[PDB]
Design a protein around this ligand. Structure first.
Ligand SMILES: [Cl-]
Ligand SMILES: [Cl-]
Ligand SMILES: [Cl-]
Ligand SMILES: [Cl-]
Ligand SMILES: [Zn+2]
Ligand SMILES: [Zn+2]
Lengths: 21, 30, 30, 21, 30, 21, 30, 21, 30, 21, 30, 21
């Protein structure tokens, strides 16, 4: 998931925005 | 914006900045 | 432990500390 | 909610566990 | 995204998040 | 400047990009 | 509470949250 | 010690509480 | 260097920066 | 103490060294 | 002061503490 | 540069002070 992706590879702020309420 | 390499608490800081007052959910595997 | 004021990014750092792998939600609108 | 309990007021580490998944 | 108050070390964390490898300047005197 | 725009007032992540190199 | 993996400054943040107004001592080896 | 244990393996908040004043 | 206001978790981050391996005590009651 | 010197008032990085072990 | 091992956002925090109101520039390679 | 040096080896606060405005 996002938590793992950001850490083991990379992730964007736009991908992060999907986890906002 | 640039791509991010974020582990542990640094991910939560990023979510906080990105989402602001909307809040967010932090849901790691396992 | 203790009781203190926890706001903003400090509040989310504390949620990450306390919840960790469980995950958590930060929903300030309520 | 959380802001009222923990920022405006004062809360324990135990109270924070109320917001875990 | 959102608009929030970002001060001090939180402001610089946000600049690092947004700019990353580009770099940035933090010049509060202006 | 940045303090006025983002701390005293309120700013977006886009506005913060104004201070990138 | 969950178990913690904490290095450098992240340990000091955790001690701060755990101890609150009691304060704490940070005493690394060597 | 605690500083090293938390970093090279894991540690609990309850172990951390021992370092409070 | 400079003089600034350092409070709470920011104060302890600064102690960790300045003291590092020496260790430090944070004893706000005094 | 430290809170008075550095939070309530203003302190230098040198003054902070007063609290090292 | 002691020597520092600082990566990512931790470097920016250190620059913030060191420079204070003077501000600073964060300029990584590439 | 400094960004890389602090991360891959070590750096001092005095070296960091060179990056202040
Ligand atoms: Cl704050
Ligand atoms: Cl603050
Ligand atoms: Cl790390
Ligand atoms: Cl604060
Ligand atoms: Zn880190
Ligand atoms: Zn703060």
């Amino acid at each position: 998931g996002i938590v793992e992706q950001c850490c083991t590879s990379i992730c964007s702020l736009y991908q992060l925005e999907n986890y906002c309420n | 914006f640039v791509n991010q390499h974020l582990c542990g608490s640094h991910l939560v800081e990023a979510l906080y900045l990105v989402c602001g007052e909307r809040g967010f959910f932090y849901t790691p595997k396992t």
